[PDB]
Design an enzyme around this catalytic site. Sequence first.
Site: not given
Length: 240
Positions: A45, A64, A93, A186, A188-189
Amino acid sequence: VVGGTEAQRNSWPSQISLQYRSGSSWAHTCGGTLIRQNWVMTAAHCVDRELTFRVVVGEHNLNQNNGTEQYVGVQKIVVHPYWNTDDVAAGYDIALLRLAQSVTLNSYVQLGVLPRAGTILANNSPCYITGWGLTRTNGQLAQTLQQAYLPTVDYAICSSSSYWGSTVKNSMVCAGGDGVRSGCQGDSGGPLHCLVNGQYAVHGVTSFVSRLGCNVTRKPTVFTRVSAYISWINNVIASN
Ligand code: NA
């Protein structure tokens, strides 16, 4: 990651940041796991959108310069052929990204170790999620890499009615669900790292959380079960 702590700079050297080009700028969108010097494992996704993506390895602080980052374009994307973006609950997924360059390994950049095919963790197994995702439901990305202790929730409990019911499949891993700690957007994966026989391996690819919120009691974070996909991963790398 909700309810996390800041990770030490060299704790999770297979963690990557997947970023897309946004005008003159790059934005974090997802995590991943470096699994070859030129291959990253992430969620399907995460790459549904037709964007320009890059991978950052050796990242710690997104805003940074750390002096350890390598920035590499994504050259090819191979999504699991059964993935359906309007059906995340079906599973599959998972996606592999071939990098334009091979990255250099060092204490900040290492390959993630994958479990053996078919491996299923016992209920309440010790794992950490890592990422730069939201630190509260409807919050904002973390600046520095976070980790949270998320023990597994086995299929029989996770697919029970008060947890995820039929939404969770045996091709997934559930972890957490305490109402305090969780993955969030954020993350995810990225990886779920679980300690087995003394060694951390990446058992999960973060896939989804509840529509009600990230840290919801009895809605543990849900991950693609890496050990369901070992032959798929090898076949893709072997063929690309
Ligand atoms: Na940085």
